[PDB]
Amino acid sequence: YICGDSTECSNLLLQYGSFCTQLKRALTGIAVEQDKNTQEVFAQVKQIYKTPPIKYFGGFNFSQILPDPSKPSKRSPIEDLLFNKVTLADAGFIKQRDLICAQKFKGLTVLPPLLTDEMIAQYTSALLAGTITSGWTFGAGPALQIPFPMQMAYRFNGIGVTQNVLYENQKLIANQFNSAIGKIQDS
Amino acid sequence: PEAEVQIDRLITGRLQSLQTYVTQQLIRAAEIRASANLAATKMSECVLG
Amino acid sequence: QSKRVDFCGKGYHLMSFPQSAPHGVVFLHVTYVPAQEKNFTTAPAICHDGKAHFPREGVFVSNGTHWFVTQRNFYEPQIITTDNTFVSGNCDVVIGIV
Amino acid sequence: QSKRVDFCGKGYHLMSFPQSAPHGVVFLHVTYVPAQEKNFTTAPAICHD
Amino acid sequence: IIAYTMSLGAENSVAYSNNSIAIPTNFTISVTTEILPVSMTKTSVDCTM
């Protein structure tokens, strides 16, 4: 970046000495910090959980948030929509008219993240499978299975609402949830 | 003797530019670290419970 | 005692003990971790004579022959009484009632 | 109402009132502070029959 | 020295059904550490020295 790399200009950066190493240390610390940030956010579980092959959860339709196995990305329709709405400008790949990533020739490269998109999607899938099949039990110990209407009846007691409010309106609450998830893609 | 002071002017320009870029990257990295700590806290307290 | 999940260690928080450290603090988070679970057949409600019975604090579980009320985070089976349950509605509206 | 200890003032939190301030906000945290305690002899359980 | 794709975690399928619940019969009292920084070393710099 400083010198044209076809020259003895680099023989005068030794007169300053410890400055470029200080940037390389600082940017390395930033990069390791970003990988640590992704690891702290998404690696909340030590086990990769899966949904049962029969996706019936008392009338609650999770097909727009669970991963779609018919696509090679192994992502949900919402996640496949989210990656399409971000005009991503990274250059974390080996592959070499010119675009904005011709700034690599001035010494400005982009390092790829430690966790790929597929591994973050698998962490998200494990978190979703845990919170659907086991409630809050998998986050404070071993995963304990529970019916999802029974899970939602536990979650209604956490807001001061009795259990019979859910069970006498289970179809209504399932329909409201399925309508509200479907409006997320439209929004 | 004259190309040296001309390139010393240019090299000090590139030194200042790189130090400025790394200072903004450290500030934005602190902001992204705060946002990621908030995201991990929201993951643990909204998703896991 | 914090109800925030994983704010004070992994598990259900009971206590924490601070310890002095060079340029920092070390917390010893005492948590409650469930262990040795068993599979039980459950039901949302019990239908006695037309009334629907729901647990006041616990959960209806079955060992295959008899149904019990136990607390949610520890297996402690109890006889289904009107002291353990409350009555709301009838048996025609709850999906999965037994 | 927050169950977080000392997040909304010292004591058992009941209410809080915001007030406008120059370049900031002032909260008036209404907390429940116990007072005038008395010693008693206690037991973990009572055995009847 | 070997190179490998990282194992993302253990594999566990939760035995979900519409009428089965898992309740623990025992427990484990677990104590874990959390080391967390508070202060850093205070430095003073003389200008002319």
In angstroms, the first-to-last Cα distance of chain B is 70
- Which residues does chain D have within 8 Å of residue C4's beta carbon, measured at their own beta carbons? 4
Nearest to A170 among C35, C54, C95 (CB): C95
The two structure tokens encoding residue D36? 């005038």
Write the secondary structure of chain E as one string of H (helix), E (strand) and C (coil). Answer: CCCCCCCCCEEEECCCCCCEEEEEEEEEEEEEEEEEECCCCCCCCCCCC
β-strands E10-13, C24-43 pairing: unpaired
Q: Using alpha carbons, select from C68, C83, A43, A65 the residue that is nearest to residue B39.
A: A43
Burial class, A165, CB count within 10 angstroms (exposed 0-12 / middle 13-18 / buried 19+): middle
The two structure tokens encoding residue A121? 């999607």
Mark out the alpha helices in D1-49 (DSSP H runs). Answer: none
Asked if E17 has any chain A CB less than 8 Å from its own CB, the reply is yes
Q: How far apart are CA A105 and CA A1, in angstroms?
A: 9
Contact A55, A148 (CB under 8 A): no
Asked if C83 has any chain B CB less than 8 Å from its own CB, the reply is no
- Which residues does chain E have within 8 Å of residue C25's beta carbon, measured at their own beta carbons? 36, 38
Nearest to B32 among A12, A37, A136 (CB): A37
- Which residues does chain C have within 8 Å of residue A150's beta carbon, measured at their own beta carbons? 42, 44, 59
Q: Which residues pair with D42 in a beta bridge?
A: none
Asked if E23 has any chain A CB less than 8 Å from its own CB, the reply is yes
Residue type, A182: G
Query: Which DSSP state fits A66?
Result: S
Resolution in A: 3.6
Flag whether A touches C (3+ CB pairs, 8 A cutoff).
Answer: yes
Contact C25, C19 (CB under 8 A): yes
Experimentally, the structure was elucidated by cryo-EM
Quick one: which H or E segment has residue B9?
helix B3-42
A71, A72, A74, A78 alpha-carbon torsion, rounded to 10°: -50
